[PDB]
Amino acid sequence: PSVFLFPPKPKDTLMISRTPEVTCVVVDVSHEDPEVKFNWYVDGVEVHNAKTKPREEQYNSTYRVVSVLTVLHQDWLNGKEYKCKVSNKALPAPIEKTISKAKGQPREPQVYTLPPSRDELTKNCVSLTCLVKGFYPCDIAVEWESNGQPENNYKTTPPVLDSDGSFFLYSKLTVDKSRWQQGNVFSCSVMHEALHNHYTQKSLSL
Amino acid sequence: GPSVFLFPPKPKDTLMIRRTPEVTCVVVDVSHEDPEVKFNWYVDGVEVHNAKTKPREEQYNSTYRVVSVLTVLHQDWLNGKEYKCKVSNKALPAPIEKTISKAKGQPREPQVYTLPPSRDELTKNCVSLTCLVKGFYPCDIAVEWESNGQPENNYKTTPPVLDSDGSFFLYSKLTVDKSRWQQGNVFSCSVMHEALHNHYTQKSLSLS
Ligand SMILES: *[C@@H]1O[C@H](CO[C@@H]2O[C@@H](C)[C@@H](O)[C@@H](O)[C@@H]2O)[C@@H](O[C@@H]2O[C@H](CO)[C@@H](O[C@@H]3O[C@H](CO[C@H]4O[C@H](CO)[C@@H](O)[C@H](O)[C@@H]4O[C@@H]4O[C@H](CO)[C@@H](O)[C@H](O)[C@H]4NC(C)=O)[C@@H](O)[C@H](O[C@H]4O[C@H](CO)[C@@H](O)[C@H](O)[C@@H]4O[C@@H]4O[C@H](CO)[C@@H](O)[C@H](O)[C@H]4NC(C)=O)[C@@H]3O)[C@H](O)[C@H]2NC(C)=O)[C@H](O)[C@H]1NC(C)=O
Ligand SMILES: *[C@@H]1O[C@H](CO[C@@H]2O[C@@H](C)[C@@H](O)[C@@H](O)[C@@H]2O)[C@@H](O[C@@H]2O[C@H](CO)[C@@H](O[C@@H]3O[C@H](CO[C@H]4O[C@H](CO)[C@@H](O[C@@H]5O[C@H](CO)[C@@H](O)[C@H](O)[C@H]5NC(C)=O)[C@H](O)[C@@H]4O)[C@@H](O)[C@H](O[C@H]4O[C@H](CO)[C@@H](O[C@@H]5O[C@H](CO)[C@@H](O)[C@H](O)[C@H]5NC(C)=O)[C@H](O)[C@@H]4O)[C@@H]3O)[C@H](O)[C@H]2NC(C)=O)[C@H](O)[C@H]1NC(C)=O
């Protein structure tokens, strides 16, 4: 049995209204000796907030067991380590994994909206570009909205390490050229721990 | 125990006849108990024997790492031929086969758009030059920046990202002194893709 530990989603940790969680997924759980125990420690201190989820089956006759631990927003943002100890007798080794936020000084993201190029106006749909650069850590959330209504036809590139040690990304919202030249205003909403109120908003219009 | 990893040719290699594209079959975790591994190569089923196997090099973890390199024809890879590397070892319950090929599907011509720096960014000393390449298929592509026929070499390119229409898009960002951009220098975004004429195109960008 091999374990894969996952971090909380960036949006969950930045808004107090949401609940961030650390996901500990055991993937090679076997029918024999399926007693997969879960002990959780924050900064080495055992905590009892976890809730193991029901198992799942696959096409390779292998079970999947997941334990979900709710985490405090500041605990993750302060860098505290989370250790997922998996106690299963399927294999002798008591596999243990640790997770933590990336260490280092958070750097404020820079948000620049870029209008579509003149060459793209030939096409029936144009591309609205949102450039976010100079942020650290890579944990970030980017969304698009217009008139207080979220847009859905956007894709965000994964964060990429830059020369200066910071991260950058692009978010591309694709809309009909009619909407663009009708004068509609679109906004790129960026959430990051180094932002004031963990949120900034840049607008783009004709 | 032994593990096999198959690597595709670099996108620039397959797109230029001048360069030599190749497929690398890397075997790790080769113990001294059975240090001899066999590389058998197949191309769409037919067994080929122009592969050059490198001598077994032992690593510091008492594990051997053997590598075989198969030179592939540019047209063969672009016609979707499948390259299979069969690795045989006496410490293996069964010989391990790995297959690599160009992403199956219909090629899509990339659209190249150069985007000027934001006016808000002009307050800085370094400005960002953006090259949007979208609507291409498959993933294999190369993006480079140059000015005055000389590589800029101060740019970072995002990975290809699967768009909603099934194609791929990416952004390449070139960081340049705000003095150079305002000085009037013209920079060009070079994109190499199989669905491009001569597998090459250039879109330029300058203060307008
Ligand atoms: C003993 O040591 C050796 C190495 O020794 C070395 O030298 C000695 C002297 C010491 O100093 C060592 O410290 C030193 O490391 C160990 O060999 C390693 O073994 C591991 C696995 O156990 C391999 O990991 C894999 O890596 C590949 C990528 O490898 C490229 O990038 C590496 C960057 O570090 C580079 O080192 C590699 O050489 C290789 O680089 C490429 O080389 C080719 C050669 O021609 C070149 O053309 C390329 O340009 C070049 N690229 C770059 C960027 O430089 C990685 O792909 C593997 O991940 C896949 O597999 C995982 C499961 O194995 C899986 O979890 C991943 O998600 C991923 O899964 C795959 O994903 C793809 C795409 O999504 C998908 O299509 C596949 O289906 C999927 N496959 C699956 C799921 O199976 C993996 O991480 C190391 O590369 C290897 N190091 C080497 C070969 O140098 C050896 O393991 C040690 N002994 C023991 C017992 O562990
Ligand atoms: C029986 O079948 C099961 C079902 O899976 C089948 O097989 C799969 C291959 C798929 O084809 C699937 O469709 C099939 O149904 C098997 O379970 C799977 O087993 C494999 C192999 O063990 C696991 O593969 C790993 O995946 C890791 C990523 O997780 C993936 O799954 C999750 C859940 O679906 C995806 O989504 C994530 O979900 C989280 C909640 O659980 C959520 O919180 C998170 O936000 C979300 N993320 C995203 C992006 O959506 C996720 O996207 C993946 O798809 C992957 O990381 C593994 O590769 C890496 O492994 C390590 C760990 O990252 C990495 O090394 C690390 O690098 C770091 C630097 O980057 C270092 O800092 C670390 O120190 C270092 N750690 C080390 C070295 O230990 C490696 O370099 C490598 O890159 C790996 O690919 C599957 O997760 C698992 N589950 C599923 C659903 O597929 C089962 O194994 C089978 N039985 C047997 C016996 O094999």
Author numbering:
A (entry chain A): 238 to 443
B (entry chain B): 237 to 444
What did the paper state?
ADCs uniquely combine the target-specificity and extended half-life of antibodies with the potent cytotoxicity of small-molecule chemotherapeutic payloads. Given the foundational research on its site-specific conjugates, we use as a model ADC the well-studied Her2 receptor-targeting antibody trastuzumab conjugated with a cleavable Ala-Ala p-aminobenzyloxycarbonyl (PABC) linker to the potent antimitotic payload monomethyl auristatin E (MMAE). Methods: In this work, we present the crystal structures of trastuzumab Fab and Fc domains site-specifically conjugated with a cleavable linker–payload. Results: Our findings suggest that pockets within both Fab and Fc regions may interact with and shield the linker portion of the conjugate.
To optimize structural studies, both hinge-containing and hinge-free Fc constructs were assessed; the hinge-free construct was ultimately selected because it consistently produced higher-quality crystals and enabled data collection at improved resolution. Distinct positive Fo-Fc electron density was detected at the engineered cysteine residues Q362C and S375C, though the signal intensity varied between the two sites. At the more solvent-exposed Q362C conjugation site, the 2Fo-Fc density was sufficient only to model the conjugated maleimide moiety of the linker–payload. In contrast, the 2Fo-Fc density at the S375C site, located in the central pocket of the Fc dimer, was sufficient to model the majority of the Ala-Ala-PABC linker in one Fc monomer. Notably, the second monomer showed limited linker density, likely reflecting increased linker–payload flexibility and indicating weaker interactions at this site. Detailed examination of the structure reveals two canonical hydrogen bonds: one between the linker NH and the backbone carbonyl of P296 and another between the linker carbamate and the main chain amide of L398. The maleimide group forms a hydrogen bond with the carboxyl side chain of D376 and a van der Waals interaction with the D376 backbone, which may help stabilize the maleimide in this non-hydrolyzed form. Several nonpolar residues surrounding the S375C site including P396, L398, V397 and F404 contribute to a buried surface area of 244 Å2, including a specific van der Waals interaction between F404 and the first alanine methyl group on the linker. Consistent with the ambiguous linker density at the S375C site, LCMS analysis of the conjugated Fc reveals a mass shift of 18 or 36 Da, indicating that maleimide hydrolysis occurs at one or both S375C sites of the Fc. Maleimide hydrolysis involves an opening of the maleimide ring, enhancing conjugation stability by preventing the retro-Michael reaction that would release the conjugate altogether. This hydrolysis suggests that the density observed in the S375C structure likely represents a mixture of hydrolyzed and non-hydrolyzed maleimide linker–payloads conjugated to C375.
